[PDB]
Amino acid sequence: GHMIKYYNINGQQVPVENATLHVSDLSILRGYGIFDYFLAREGHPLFLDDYLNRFYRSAAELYLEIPFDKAELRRQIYALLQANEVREAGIRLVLTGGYSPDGYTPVNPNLLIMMYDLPASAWEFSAQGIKIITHPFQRELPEVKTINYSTGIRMLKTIKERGATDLIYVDQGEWIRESARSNFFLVMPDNTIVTADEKILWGITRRQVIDAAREAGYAVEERRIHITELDQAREAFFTSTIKGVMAIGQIDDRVFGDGTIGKVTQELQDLFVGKVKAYLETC
């Protein structure tokens, strides 16, 4: 495991210790930007075309022009894995509103490519379900992967104080959406998989799990989820790039099962790992 030595800023490889932005950048002053994050295994960013299509769609929703095409960004990503001499990594793309003249009006974005060790916790797939709280909130521009995590970060103290390790956002306290950094699923007692269809981020992991579940012949409903449906479900889980599929054992005082991982959630962990293995066989 070679230590990460380099990032890329605006197409230039830079040592990690010299990777800076001038304080006029609109990410610092105005929180204006998008990002993406994905893993690399065996030298290959996972589901890369899907992440990069999302990154370009996000940038278009903020009217931020990425300074070159998808194939050139992919070349820069691969060049950075080779420069760092790593096969196993986390990769962050950031696209800011740039060095604005007036601290508000965007200009040519700043583009950052950052690289990390593969998170040690990635796809841990604990048999013990996590404990989470509901929080009334709706993410702004939820289909765009903006850099805006204020509410999620501000809630870290309250989450920890209340005895939880994460949250789930409930729009108007009525409609189940997503966590600050994960998509959210239920499994009903008849094995129907349920997840929100609107006003959420369209996770790559969510997409792979829904596809894998539908190919295994599960019923998957993408629909509005009322809060009262937490009392009808057998299982609950999170999806994300780093979690894969993560069992939820308790939401408020609703305990799912004995709190350990449900049968469908564990099957979907194996199916997700199958999607990853299949992708790496195309690389």
Q: How many CB atoms lie within 10 A of CB 214?
A: 12
* One character per residue 57-86, x = contact with ligand LCS (rule: CB under 6 A): ------------------------------
Write the CB contacts of 269 (distance below 8 Å, at least 6 apart in sequence): 123, 125, 244, 245, 261
Q: Which does 239 bind (CB under 5 to 8 A by kind): ligand LCS, its own copies, none?
A: ligand LCS
Site for its own copies in 131-160 (CB under 8 A): 140-141, 146-154, 156-157
Q: Is 177 helix (H, G, I), strand (E, B) or coil?
A: coil
Say which residues have a Cβ less than 8 Å from residue 204's Cβ, sequence separation at least 6.
38, 47, 50, 51, 54, 241
CB-nearer residue toward ligand LCS: 255 or 278: 278
Rounded to whole angstroms, the Cα distance separating 128 from 130 reads: 7
- Spell out, one character per residue from 199 to 238, where the chain touches ligand LCS: x when CB under 6 A holds, - when not: --x-xxxx--------------------------------
Write down the least CB distance from residue 258 to its own copies, Å. Answer: 30
Count of residues that interact with its own copies, criterion CB under 8 A: 44
The sign of the dihedral angle between the CA atoms of 257, 263, 269, 272 is: negative
Q: Which two tokens stand for residue 56?
A: 């370009």
Angle at 89 between CA 272 and CA 150, to 5 degrees: 80
The interface with ligand LCS within residues 238-277 (CB under 6 A) comprises 239-242
Tokens of 107: 């200009």
Residue 152 Cβ, how far from its own copies at the closest point, in Å? 8
Instruction: Single out the segment in contact with its own copies by CB under 8 A; choices: 16-24, 199-207, 245-253, 257-265.
Output: 16-24
- Which letter does DSSP use for residue 123 in this model? T
List of residues contacting its own copies (CB under 8 A): 7, 9, 19-23, 25-33, 35, 61-63, 92, 94, 96-97, 103-106, 112, 114, 140-141, 146-154, 156-157, 181
Annotated binding site: 28, 54, 149, 204-205, 241, 258, 260
